[PDB]
Design a protein around this ligand. Sequence first.
Ligand SMILES: CC(=O)N[C@H]1[C@H](O[C@@H]2[C@@H](O)[C@@H](O)O[C@H](CO)[C@@H]2O)O[C@H](CO)[C@@H](O[C@@H]2O[C@@H](C)[C@@H](O)[C@@H](O)[C@@H]2O)[C@@H]1O[C@@H]1O[C@H](CO)[C@H](O)[C@H](O)[C@H]1O
Ligand SMILES: CC(=O)N[C@H]1[C@H](O[C@@H]2[C@@H](O)[C@H](O)O[C@H](CO)[C@@H]2O)O[C@H](CO)[C@@H](O[C@@H]2O[C@@H](C)[C@@H](O)[C@@H](O)[C@@H]2O)[C@@H]1O[C@@H]1O[C@H](CO)[C@H](O)[C@H](O)[C@H]1O
Ligand SMILES: CC(=O)N[C@@H]1[C@@H](O[C@@H]2O[C@H](CO)[C@H](O)[C@H](O)[C@H]2O)[C@H](O[C@@H]2O[C@@H](C)[C@@H](O)[C@@H](O)[C@@H]2O)[C@@H](CO)O[C@H]1O
Ligand code: CA
Ligand code: CA
Ligand code: CA
Ligand code: CA
Ligand code: CA
Ligand code: CA
Ligand code: CA
Ligand code: CA
Lengths: 114, 114, 114, 114
Amino acid sequence: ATQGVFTLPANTQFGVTAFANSAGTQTVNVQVNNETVATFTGQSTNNAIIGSKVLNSGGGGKVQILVSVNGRSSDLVSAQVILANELNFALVGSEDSTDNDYNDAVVVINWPLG
Amino acid sequence: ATQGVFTLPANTQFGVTAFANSAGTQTVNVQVNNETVATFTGQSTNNAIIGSKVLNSGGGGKVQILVSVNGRSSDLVSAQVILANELNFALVGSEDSTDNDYNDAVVVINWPLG
Amino acid sequence: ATQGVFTLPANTQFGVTAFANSAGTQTVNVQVNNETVATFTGQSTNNAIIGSKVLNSGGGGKVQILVSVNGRSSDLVSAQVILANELNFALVGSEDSTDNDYNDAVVVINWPLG
Amino acid sequence: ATQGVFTLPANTQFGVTAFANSAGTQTVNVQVNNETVATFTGQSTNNAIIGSKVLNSGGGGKVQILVSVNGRSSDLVSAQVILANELNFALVGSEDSTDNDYNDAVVVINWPLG
Ligand SMILES: CC(=O)N[C@H]1[C@H](O[C@@H]2[C@@H](O)[C@@H](O)O[C@H](CO)[C@@H]2O)O[C@H](CO)[C@@H](O[C@@H]2O[C@@H](C)[C@@H](O)[C@@H](O)[C@@H]2O)[C@@H]1O[C@@H]1O[C@H](CO)[C@H](O)[C@H](O)[C@H]1O
Ligand SMILES: CC(=O)N[C@H]1[C@H](O[C@@H]2[C@@H](O)[C@H](O)O[C@H](CO)[C@@H]2O)O[C@H](CO)[C@@H](O[C@@H]2O[C@@H](C)[C@@H](O)[C@@H](O)[C@@H]2O)[C@@H]1O[C@@H]1O[C@H](CO)[C@H](O)[C@H](O)[C@H]1O
Ligand SMILES: CC(=O)N[C@@H]1[C@@H](O[C@@H]2O[C@H](CO)[C@H](O)[C@H](O)[C@H]2O)[C@H](O[C@@H]2O[C@@H](C)[C@@H](O)[C@@H](O)[C@@H]2O)[C@@H](CO)O[C@H]1O
Ligand SMILES: [Ca+2]
Ligand SMILES: [Ca+2]
Ligand SMILES: [Ca+2]
Ligand SMILES: [Ca+2]
Ligand SMILES: [Ca+2]
Ligand SMILES: [Ca+2]
Ligand SMILES: [Ca+2]
Ligand SMILES: [Ca+2]
């Protein structure tokens, strides 16, 4: 299945935060309604934050995360969870190699804000 | 039900990150095996990160999150999700008032690291 | 927080299935837009299905699950999870006593159907 | 990523339940520690239960779900969710065609029992 794609409510503020856990430098692309609106680049093997931004979901509410390392696409896994019928998390893991830890870049999207 | 308590594997490094979305200053207490090991404090209505740390789950693996505002306990909600049978997220929302957005302090725990 | 309350897409078919794991006979009440539309009763300590029905979420999309054992309300836990940005589960556990296994009645709501 | 593989606690009773939502007859294969221990076969476009069984996770705790329709493997999506640090759901959707509803066979695994 396609992974890393989430339908948010339209025209809604959300947070996006990326963490790195790999020898490789991670490149995280954030697309809103099929346009790149943020790119995070960084390297850590200890969960450093390589980007954190507030964005708007735009007319369609479509948010897509893509992860690569020097142009090679990582394999993605994702899901959305809703707590108390109101608090939303859209969660992404990614794998750049063969160990299947899926933490090489970790992306957390949260809404609502405020 | 008790919320904000998670059993991690023993002796495991994990990340903990807190976000704020409230008029009130949030205090996030992190306990590992019933001992406070981190306290994050901050105020934001726009998802500022008020703390991010790497911790070890120790012998027992017990991690607990408590959220308060000037000593008054917020109401908590939580769940754990596992992707690809390997990537773990432990998630907490909290509510300090009556609007039930549950985002007043948001806490994300992730493992494995590295 | 209130637990067992989910906003589904309006006017949408969904499944509801309940399982029992307790000495006590479980009563599961399903409300759609504040009206009881299904009641499941049964006893099992081995996960027997005590009911499964297809319902419509109606104009408001509100679905609420209540669980009781001989007239006493059980304590509820819940969350919603979305896979592949399409497949939805609303999940409820319940506890009728002191052991906090939260499996005494387990309810799974799934959509879309068809 | 590999999907439909879960590490359960070892030597633990669990429930597995399959639902069908497709024109095609679904065949669900359940493996515990790499041995087939159940096969569910059935057809429904309205969420009928095509199998429900209690199984044990054995020494290794490994559970794998595979879905096929008339010999063609369906595409899988999955995740695990834990409520109240105790109640576990391992969730699988599957897609047998082109519409990407991922509900063609839905598989729910739940533990603990009893
Ligand atoms: C009107 C106001 O300032 N409300 C904020 C609330 O203050 C009340 C105060 O007016 C008086 O009634 O005493 C109350 C306690 O008895 C309380 O102090 O304080 C809330 C707690 O900080 C605050 O809500 C928080 O912050 C908001 C920005 C929002 O993130 C909420 O989720 C959060 O719980 C009240 O702020 C208003 O909240 C409403 C929603 O209920 C709107 O967001 C308003 O824009 C906020 O001003
Ligand atoms: C031996 C080594 O350095 N392996 C890392 C591997 O290196 C590749 C390099 O050997 C080859 O010549 O070039 C390719 C690109 O064309 C690679 O650059 O690179 C992967 C991806 O960066 C590393 O795995 C990542 O970092 C690890 C620290 C870990 O977070 C892992 O999850 C992540 O995918 C390889 O590093 C090794 O990974 C293993 C586990 O497979 C151990 O963690 C080792 O300690 C670590 O060096
Ligand atoms: C024309 C035809 O017979 N198509 C078959 C699919 O059924 C149609 O699917 C579409 C959506 O793609 C829509 O529901 C139509 O009403 C169906 O007739 C069939 O798809 C499978 O069965 C569907 C009922 C639906 O559950 C879909 O998600 C599922 O994958 C496929 C595979 O059985 O066969 C097609 O020939
Ligand atoms: Ca890796
Ligand atoms: Ca890694
Ligand atoms: Ca609030
Ligand atoms: Ca708030
Ligand atoms: Ca119980
Ligand atoms: Ca029980
Ligand atoms: Ca389909
Ligand atoms: Ca279908």
